[PDB]
Structures are given as structure tokens and as C-alpha cells.
A paper describes a structure:
Unlike many human studies, serum nAb responses were equally potent, for example, against SARS-CoV-2 and SARS-CoV-1, showed potent neutralization of a range of sarbecoviruses, and effectively neutralized SARS-2 VOCs, including Omicron.
We isolated mAbs from two animals (K288 and K398) by sorting antigen-specific single B cells using SARS-CoV-2 and SARS-CoV-1 S-proteins as baits. To investigate the binding of the potent macaque IGHV3–73–encoded nAbs in greater detail, we determined crystal structures of K288.2 and K398.22 Ab Fabs with SARS-CoV-2 RBD at 2.3 and 1.95 Å resolution, respectively. The different binding mode for macaque antibodies allows for SARS-CoV-1 and SARS-CoV-2 cross-neutralization and retention of neutralization of VOCs. Although this particular epitope has not yet been targeted by human SARS-CoV-2 Abs with known structures as far as we are aware, the human SARS-CoV-2 nAb DH1047 (65) heavy chain binds in a similar location but in a completely different orientation so that the light chains are oppositely positioned. Likewise, another previously reported Ab that broadly neutralizes various sarbecoviruses including SARS-CoV-2, S2X259 (66), also targets a similar region but with a slightly different angle of approach to the RBD than DH1047. The epitope of another nAb S2A4 (66, 67) is slightly further down the RBD. We also tested neutralization by these cross-reactive mAbs against SARS-CoV-2 VOCs and key mutants. Consistent with the macaque serum mapping above, the mAbs were roughly equally effective against variants Alpha, Beta, Gamma, and Delta with some Abs moderately more and some moderately less potent than against the ancestral virus. For Omicron, most of the Abs were less potent (10- to more than100-fold), but about a third were approximately equally potent as against the ancestral virus.
Author numbering:
A (entry chain Z): 334 to 527
B (entry chain H): 1 to 231
C (entry chain L): 1 to 214
The structure:
Amino acid sequence: NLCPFGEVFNATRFASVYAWNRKRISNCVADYSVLYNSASFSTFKCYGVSPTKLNDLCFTNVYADSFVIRGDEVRQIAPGQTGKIADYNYKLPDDFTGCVIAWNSNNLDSKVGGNYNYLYRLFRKSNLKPFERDISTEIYQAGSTPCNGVEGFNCYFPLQSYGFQPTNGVGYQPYRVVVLSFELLHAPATVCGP
Amino acid sequence: EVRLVESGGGLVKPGGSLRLSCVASGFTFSSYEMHWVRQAPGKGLEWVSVISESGATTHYTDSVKGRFTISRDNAKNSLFLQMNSLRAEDTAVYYCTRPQSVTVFGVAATSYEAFDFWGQGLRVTVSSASTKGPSVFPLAPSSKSTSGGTAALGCLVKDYFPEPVTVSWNSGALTSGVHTFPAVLQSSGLYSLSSVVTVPSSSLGTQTYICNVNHKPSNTKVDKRVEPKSC
Amino acid sequence: DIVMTQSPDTLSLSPGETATLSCRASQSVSSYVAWYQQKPEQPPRLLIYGSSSRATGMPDRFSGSGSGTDFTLTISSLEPDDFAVYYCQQYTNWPLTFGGGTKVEIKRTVAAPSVFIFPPSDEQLKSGTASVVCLLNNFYPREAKVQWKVDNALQSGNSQESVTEQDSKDSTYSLSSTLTLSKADYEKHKVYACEVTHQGLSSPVTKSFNRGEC
Ligand SMILES: C[As](C)(=O)[O-]
Ligand SMILES: C[As](C)(=O)[O-]
Ligand SMILES: C[As](C)(=O)[O-]
């Protein structure tokens, strides 16, 4: 009863961070060693759980969130961080119990002339609540004017595109991120190891 | 002028550790991502590590991931490579390398193409052997070291560590026809080389021949006279 | 990891001729290829980036071409300064990888080596080891075979070779081969020979000596 992990990690395309994807994992067994024993990952921090213990612990349902950001922003995917990504795109709760996995994906997500399919949110009237997905495309009002659905002076379209090129500096290169969330409600647990 | 002064290399035993430093000058250090590349003795170039301008992103080759850490202090124009649990195959000349910026005008993301500047390099030697002076032996001229009226003589510099040694003949007086060979790494971990010179056979009786060997890493200066041998 | 295979390992040319150095990638790297020159005891120097773009201050006799997986460096009208080692590099796929390198050596005519042999010194013998040294002087090209014979038994595994770089005047090479034994093993045998084969020699050249007579 294998859990669909190669689905999440080996997916052809990844989601933009503002429209981050979430896959629920339920009613299956999963080996976490086939993951945390890979040297391919550039980042593997865990919170509220020993990664080694994951093979013998068991949880209600598991959430796998995935998206693309640029390298310098990977540090923002952590409990209690601030910045453009942590505030307007994807925010972790301070009580976060799970693991954050990230690896460079310049060979998949960079394109000659620039891959503009990956977007992030530059402006938002307020900070995101944890695990909130804001896909609003209405125009930001940075001044006092009513933009009437068109962009002008201090009337900004809130989403902006990464220009991922193969020659970008490593800090501006695309990174694929997967966030595993583990919750233990009072409902029966259906995701455990061997 | 663009300059990258490197420091902090040298000798280490297997399982030891080093910290290489590279101070930059002549350009805006904080605007450049920076790399470490290495070159093993007699081998080609291997890329090692990269760090972004801010230092928030680092990337390593697989054979050093988890052992090496690249870092930078932009306030001090400094780049560092911390090397832990060093292995014999980590022996190399290490270069801090500045990639060539191609960022056009005021775009937010930086772009780079190839390496446009290299430091002079730091030697890093990971070996069980320890610093040791050399033994100097004569390679005596004889009938077996003649091709017609050409005689060949020399001296053999054996069992020293680390590199290098310097060899002269008659205190720099004799330089014509002198071959000093690159050192070879013996199976014991120590180095060996030989220095030879061809002279006219008839000059062996009249001309005296002394070889002068200097090993600075251990403060050794030996002079050995090479005399003919019946054979 | 993308492998960058350079070919060939050595080109032997004279000044004024044209050097064509090939580099092939195990998968496509578009035009993201560079070429560097390295001289002994110096860091590499960037010559070409973007497959075809010259670095600032490169002479126009250096030129680059190619894409996808096939790349070429052309050095027109070779000057004495251009005889060095050359590396290709792809710089967009992690890990960044370099080619094995190609040496551009000076061309000259075939020259047979002069062969000499040296028995171990007595001071070394009193220290418990014995080094027999065979010397090959001023030959070309670099390819040369030295075979040690002890009482006509072919030895392998206890000798080491070391070859100089191309001589600045006659463009020849020199080589040394050391056979190392313990004192006891050295005194178990009588005849020590080094037999040299080289394309400049009609037949193998053997130089030998008898231990104790020397
Ligand atoms: C199909 As999708 C949300 O991964 O672009
Ligand atoms: C940089 As050059 C090969 O002209 O010395
Ligand atoms: C393969 As080579 C002789 O150019 O080091």
C-alpha cells in the first residue's frame, strides 16, 4: 500500500508559490528513508519530529505542499519567518510539525530566454494566515485612487513572474519545495511506516 | 585592480580539517556570487562550491556535500571554504573564482557566464605522511652511463615530504643539459625525484660535479659530490 | 552530471598552423560552454564564453563555435605562446563540469632517446634499500616504453616513471624510471637491465649491469 510520493517529488511541472498545490496523503504506508537518505536535496529541516522516528510513528493524514521559489527565498519556508514569500505567498505556523524539503531545479524550470510561467505575489493588503492560498488577481491599490480594473499610477497588478534563465545566479535559480505536514487529530490514523 | 588573495591551506591528516580564506579587492564583492574550484595533481579541474551574493543560497558537488561549507563575510570582502573530515582525494590546488557577470542594466536577477577571474591557488595536501627531509644519493657516472663520449651523472632525492625541493648543480654554475624531473609519489606517501646532467666523458676526471638540494618545508640543505664509479 | 569529453588528448603542431580542439557533451547544454587556457603553475585563463563570444582582450585568432552537444575551439596562426593546455566547461547544469583537457605540443621530427643506467649508491645500500635508475634523454614523441629485467625476469609493479615537459630548445622529452627494492632482494639477483622501446629505435635497446661488479 505505497503512498504517492513520487507523484509529488517527480511531477513534471510544479505550482507557482502563490497558487501552491496541496496533496492529501491518506490510507497507505510510506517509507521515509527512501527520502531522507537522498543527497539530492539541498535543504531538509524537520520540526516537532525526528526524521528517523518517522518510520515508526503514524499520523492521521499527511499534507504535501509543493511549489517553486528562487534559491535565496528558501530560508523563508520555516516557522516564524518574514519576507515577501513568507508574508504574501506561503506561511508556516509557529507550531509547525513537519519537514521542509528543497532542491535546485535549474535544469527543469529554467528556459532559454526566460521561463515566466512561475509567479509570486509582490503586494497584499495584509499578511497571510498560515496555510492560506491567495489566488486573487484583482489590482492592488497602493494609493488613494480607484483603479477600475486597470493598472496605472500606484495601481499595480499584484502578481509578478520569475525570469528563470539557465545563466541566473544560483540565488535567483528555481528551487522546488515540498512541505510535509503531520497532524494527529482524534480521528483514526491511516498513514504510518513499515 | 581585481585581486583575490588566498590563505589557509597546507598539510592535514585524513580526518583533519582546514579553513581556506580568500580576500577580494578591486571590485564590489557583495554583488558577485562566488565559487571554489579545485585541481588535483596531474588531473583536470573540478568544480566544488558556489555561494550567492547574499550568502542565502549555497550549492556543492556531491563528493563534498555535508563535509564542506562555503560562506562569506561581505563586510570584510571575504570568502571561506571550511573542510571537515578531509580525505586523501581532497588533495588539490584550490582556487576561489569570480564568475563573469552579464547582468544587463537594472534587472533584478543577476546572470553569469563562465569564470572571468581566478586566484593564484592554495595547495591542500591530505596525507598520512608527515614532514620529513630528503636523503640524497649519487647517480654515479660510469661506462654504463655513456653513449659514446657523452656521460650522464646525477643525484637522487628520496623520501621527502611535502613538496617541493630545489636542485642546482655546482651552485647554479652548470645549467646546460640539466634535467630535473617532476617528483613522484611513492607508495609510502613520500616523494622522490632525480636530477641528471650530461657532460663530455673526458671531463669526468678533471671537472668536479656537486649537486645542491634545498628542502625549505623542513629546513634541509644538502650538498652531495658525485664521483665516477668502476662498472 | 554532464560529461565533457575533449578530443584528442594531444595535438602536435608548429607555429603558424591551425589547432582544432573538440569538446562533446553527454547531453545538450545549448551555447553555455566556455574555453580556458592553462599554463604550468598558473590558474586557468578564460578565452571563450557563450560557445562563440571572446573574452575581453582575446586575440581574434581564438574562435569558438558549436551548440547542443558539439563544440570547437579554433586557434588560427599558432604563436609560441599558444602551446598550453585547453579546457572546455559547461556552466549551467549542476555540477559544473570541465573537460579532461587537450595539450597543444610543438611538432618536431622523431628522435630516439639516449639510454643510461645507474646502479644504487653504497650509502643507500647501507640504509637498507636500493634504487636502480634508467634514464631516457632527449627523445620525441613522448610515447616510450621502459621494461625492467632482473636476471631476465620481467619486472612490473616496483618501478615508477617521471617525464619532463617539452624542452624549450629542441622540443624533446626526457624520462626517468626508478626500480626500488630492499637490500636483501637486491642482493638476491645478479643482472639488472632496462630495455627501452621507442618508435625512433629500430629494435629494443638494453642497458644492463652485474651487481657486485659495480
Ligand atoms: C496542473 As498544476 C496546478 O501543477 O500547474
Ligand atoms: C590572453 As593571450 C592567449 O593573448 O596571452
Ligand atoms: C589528457 As592531457 C595529456 O591534455 O592532460
